Amino acid sequence: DEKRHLYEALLRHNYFPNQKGSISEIPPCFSSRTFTPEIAELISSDTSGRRSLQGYDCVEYYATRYNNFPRTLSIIHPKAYSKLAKHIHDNWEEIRFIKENENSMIKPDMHADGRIIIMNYEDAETKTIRELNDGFGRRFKVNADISGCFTNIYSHSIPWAVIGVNNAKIALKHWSDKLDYFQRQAKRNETHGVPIGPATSSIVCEIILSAVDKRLRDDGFLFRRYIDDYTCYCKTHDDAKEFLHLLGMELSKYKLSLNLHKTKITNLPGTLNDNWVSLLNVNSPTKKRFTDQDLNKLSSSEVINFLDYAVQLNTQVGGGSILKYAISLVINNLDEYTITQVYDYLLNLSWHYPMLIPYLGVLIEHVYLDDGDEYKNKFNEILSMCAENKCSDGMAWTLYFCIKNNIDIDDDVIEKIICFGDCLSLCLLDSSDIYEEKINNFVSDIIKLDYEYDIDRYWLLFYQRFFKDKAPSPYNDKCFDIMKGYGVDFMPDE
Amino acid sequence: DEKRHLYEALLRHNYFPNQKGSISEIPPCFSSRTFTPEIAELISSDTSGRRSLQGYDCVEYYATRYNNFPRTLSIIHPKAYSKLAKHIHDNWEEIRFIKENENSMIKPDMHADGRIIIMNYEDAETKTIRELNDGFGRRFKVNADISGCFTNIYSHSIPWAVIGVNNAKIALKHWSDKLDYFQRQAKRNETHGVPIGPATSSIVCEIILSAVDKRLRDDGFLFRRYIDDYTCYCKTHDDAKEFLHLLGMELSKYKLSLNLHKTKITNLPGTLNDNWVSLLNVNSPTKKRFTDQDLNKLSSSEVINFLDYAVQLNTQVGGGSILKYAISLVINNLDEYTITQVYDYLLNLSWHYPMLIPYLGVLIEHVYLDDGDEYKNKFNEILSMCAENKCSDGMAWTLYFCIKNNIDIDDDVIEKIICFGDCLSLCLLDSSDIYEEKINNFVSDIIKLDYEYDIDRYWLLFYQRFFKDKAPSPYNDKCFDIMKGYGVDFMPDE
Amino acid sequence: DEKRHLYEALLRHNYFPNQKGSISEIPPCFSSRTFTPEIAELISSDTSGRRSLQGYDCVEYYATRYNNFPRTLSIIHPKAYSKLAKHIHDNWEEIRFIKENENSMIKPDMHADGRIIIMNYEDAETKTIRELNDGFGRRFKVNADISGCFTNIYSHSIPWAVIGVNNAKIALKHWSDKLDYFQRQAKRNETHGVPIGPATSSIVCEIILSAVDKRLRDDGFLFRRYIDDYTCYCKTHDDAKEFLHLLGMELSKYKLSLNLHKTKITNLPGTLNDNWVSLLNVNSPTKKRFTDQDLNKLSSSEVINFLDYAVQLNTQVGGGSILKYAISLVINNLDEYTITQVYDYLLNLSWHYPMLIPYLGVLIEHVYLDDGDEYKNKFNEILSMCAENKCSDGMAWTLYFCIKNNIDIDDDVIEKIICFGDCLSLCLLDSSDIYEEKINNFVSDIIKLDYEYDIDRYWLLFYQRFFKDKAPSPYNDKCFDIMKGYGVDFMPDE
DNA sequence: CCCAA
DNA sequence: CCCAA
DNA sequence: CCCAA
């Protein structure tokens, strides 16, 4: 069944921000499996406990983008997420009209690993064929995206996009009103915005934007959208301005507006990908496959010169993930001679850009970690700068690398981790069990603060301490006991 | 004999604009073989008929350059061209002094296919050796070309360049005066300019410019010329200015002048080819030959990224045929997996630039033209764009592709073809025989206009309708009957 | 022993400017072997003769840099150099503290060929690993070099850097005061500057700059130096300014100052090499080794296009030896088909840039030098332009190529060689023996000038004429007779 | 080798 | 094929 | 690996 696949995707595969297909933003130690549909079915049925504050807060995660900009990912509290996933699954025969959208390329699908929503799983050549077919006969292209799409979704517009704005306002129950209520309860009983990273909020964004896609399709516009980014192919410039006007109208019906910084009109024939994609791919040392494994093993000079050229391209242009793409080009074709030099280059670059930190794990097995203690200083310096820069992806990834490889962590950098106080880094330190007393003091300060939302911001740390029998449940409800008795661990071992 | 080779080259190989060696501007359906020496010798002997207007007009052809600029090629009326070719050949012992010019790189030669004049047949490495030898010891280079060379040749300067300006003016018969008269009769009895595309007018341009080459050679200038483009290599900047002054003097003796837009002086060592030639060739996926056919078959990613990089370089520089060179680099090394994707890229690019339309025929055999009817809309959209842009090369090439592959043509674009009214497109539609009535109405309107020059502009269409016995001969002379009786078809089948 | 290796390095390997490891600035006909420590020990013991002028002048050599700038190399007179080398060797247990410097990368070492000091023998990958290790954790890099380092070394600062500035001034014998006196006698009894090219003056520069390296190391600065170029890696911009201030202080203690033109602060991550290094290496046709000799033999088009792209990169940037690196990339991977075309390209480029003249000797064997006399005009034109530009490296290299390949030299270019009057070109003409009378007139004019320094500027020519018994010794001392009796030839045959 | 002029 | 949105 | 400084 496909409805059951929705349930398993919502809880076990796309509860955490696992939407990135190439490499996960969150380290693989955190996971959402062994959280079955039956367990959320029990949690939604549970009525015990009482909370002074309406709604729930979420575990916060600040991931660096290509330009070192923070992106706010959220892990929803399992009570609110269990109710939301239950209500989404129980009415998928009313919701699955977002599956049959030809203008939304990123949408729920029945994938092999189980995830409904994977960003950029379709790969650039299937994108290339479609972009070539769409761009034919048109001489202008429009790139326009919503300004704050996920962060300013108005939750009460969820009923509107289901049944029309006017009919929903006149009717002021239906399933989408309850979906509105549950999506509000997911984030502090707040109507504006949705959490970023779970697939329930991406489903909500698909539900809202599918009405705009429908009313743009009915006017004969040939357009594609990737989440919030609309690309349009127009024969004339006036049709481009008319598409922009109609898109602004239909988004303004749902309290949404265009990002006019990124909204631009270019003259076809433009590059199908970005410019730096083609510049890196013509200069790539692995752009030709020789079908024998010895011939495509790159020497040290080739990889080093490609990485320096990529650094120059990223510094000169700065309009995309040049370094990310470039290191992912040449990281699997190394031989054992240049593993250490490329690892040193990646260590320097991953210090200078935290987004390149997750790559080290694919080269961390071949490099001898002990060596002359130098890599311990490497990782501690990266940890310290990650604490100063208040980034979560690099910080958690570096802690994962230190713990998984039995690499010692200094006390001063533990103190600045405490001062940073991001939830998932503290969950990793809790899993280390060395710093149990300092984690105890931190969660104790959260407890005597007496704020429900501050406990909700660290529910994952509190539940991980509860699962190893090191802390009582801060909540008076039985959701944590239901999760523990039925075996839910968010840091599972093999 | 070399004189006989001249006559066969003039009639069967270089009557049509066939000077491009890589790919013909005119589709292969139009041809000038089965127009033997004997038929031209008969037509020159014919004295029947009468014409109210002196001279003849020519079939007009508008070919897009690299920057989408129209270039006017002309197909001379076979009476005038037959007389002109006979007069050129019968005195080749007086004319062949243009063969022994070391400064004219493009000139008549005894080629394998039969053509006397092929532009850029020597290839860039034989050009490289000569350019390296010429550039040595000189630190300045001059690039200067005639402003409107073929379009502003004075016909009366043809006797001058044979016997001196002053001697010919004092003498005011000689063979060059009759060559003047015949070159005038080729284009409406007009002294100014020559038709572009036949080799008789290129022979005339060689005759005129060889005197300038002689009086530039006598002063010791080391220079080369490609038709009208003069390159010069000077040790000093003042020798460059003196070469420019002497070239201006000797061209002004023949009512000719330099294009000072393209006249520029650069500092050696400059590159032998253009810049984008070098950037395309260092980034080319086929720049190394592995001597086995499986290893140099390019994958889809390599060709797609090279074409995208070529599009970026053509947009950024815009100083040459970047896209033409780039697709000719990688079009023969494809495998069957990327054939359809490259065809889609070529279809989009050939819509955006008509000069890339002739390439499609090398990939039109492998691609299934029926498919899901999409390629018919591709070709019809390209046809409508070609009719809007008033280009003849892409429009006739697309007609050739539609007719040769049994691809249907919509009626609206047929009406827009007739509105355009190019001669060779109407010849192709005549060859299709579906649109016989509309072509009949068009040539009937031309007939009731009662203008000799308007019939001469479409003589090829009129003769093709006469050859299939669908229209009477508009001319009262017997040249068309001589051509029909002895078997001249300008759309011959194999 | 390592002290003996110092002696053999000082006399037989690094007396001449042989510090460049890739290709020697001086042609290999000039050499300093068969000049053993015994002969220099004899010359230092010799007390015969008398000189009116204190000190000695040195043979002058003007080598073009990458930007065609003249660099002044000097060949020290063998009396002064023998005394200086003996005094350097006899106290190496006091001097070898420059060997144990971790901040000086170019320093004396026990090399395989025998040289103590080779510029950039470490190769760019060993530099890459060290640069990656140093660049970690730092976000600013400082590049600062001494303004006139070798040309404005104060000789009296040689004692200071040995024993402290204040102690040496208070003491105003010690071995470093005698090293001061001998380094003064090496160049005209002048305190400012040292000759460039011998290793004794590089030893002196290491001695002076090691105190600055020590007092920069004691402050904890992580820095490297290549002769006079200091690179520093600072976490903060303030520490970068503090490093610049302290470097200025410690250099000003020794009458030295930074070149603020080349002193700059860049933001890490910057490229390990220069930019054009990476651009040339991603576009290099030989960047992949296929481990079979037939597959990496480059075709003509690849080398021609790479050289054209390199010419464009050198013209566009002009910040390094783009052409030197580029031709050294692809000169050993040629096959016999493109040898002549690449040799012609090198002939044109080596005319336009004399630095590329030494490369011709690696392709001069395969190219037939007789041919149609054209290469004789090539070499004579290059000789003439080398005479006009007053450059010594290309001029002497071209004389070496003409003499070694039995290529005739015209009389007019011999006359402008005479007018230029560089010493090593005249030594090569002396070795040719054709122009013995003109060399005799030139040295006779030097003799009747009656200036000791003007004889010292051509001591190499005078000694080479003495060794073939064609001229008497201009000096009244017995150093030349000691050198002749023990078999010292600076133009030795195999 | 593969363009243009 | 290998990014992002 | 292949330059410079």
Ligand SMILES: Nc1ccn([C@H]2C[C@H](O)[C@@H](COP(=O)(O)OP(=O)(O)OP(=O)(O)O)O2)c(=O)n1
């Ligand atoms: N790992 C994930 C999971 C989900 N999303 C969602 C949230 C974003 O709203 C949407 C794409 O929108 P943008 O990245 O363009 O971001 P915004 O719309 O918030 O802002 P802006 O237009 O200013 O960039 O993708 C994401 O970015 N990253």
Ligand SMILES: Nc1ccn([C@H]2C[C@H](O)[C@@H](COP(=O)(O)OP(=O)(O)OP(=O)(O)O)O2)c(=O)n1
């Ligand atoms: N297929 C052909 C056959 C012949 N020619 C001739 C006619 C041109 O006059 C000549 C070369 O001249 P240019 O292309 O430089 O063009 P013009 O001299 O007419 O103009 P301009 O200098 O403005 O470009 O080559 C051509 O261009 N194309």
Ligand SMILES: Nc1ccn([C@H]2C[C@H](O)[C@@H](COP(=O)(O)OP(=O)(O)OP(=O)(O)O)O2)c(=O)n1
């Ligand atoms: N063949 C050789 C042998 C030795 N050196 C030395 C002398 C130079 O002083 C030193 C490097 O310093 P710079 O080339 O930077 O030269 P300067 O310090 O004299 O000048 P500037 O900073 O203006 O370039 O290397 C050299 O350049 N070439």
Ligand SMILES: [Mn+2]
């Ligand atoms: Mn957005």
Ligand SMILES: [Mn+2]
């Ligand atoms: Mn977006």
Ligand SMILES: [Mn+2]
């Ligand atoms: Mn012209």
Ligand SMILES: [Mn+2]
């Ligand atoms: Mn310096």
Ligand SMILES: [Mn+2]
């Ligand atoms: Mn021209």
Ligand SMILES: [Mn+2]
């Ligand atoms: Mn320097």
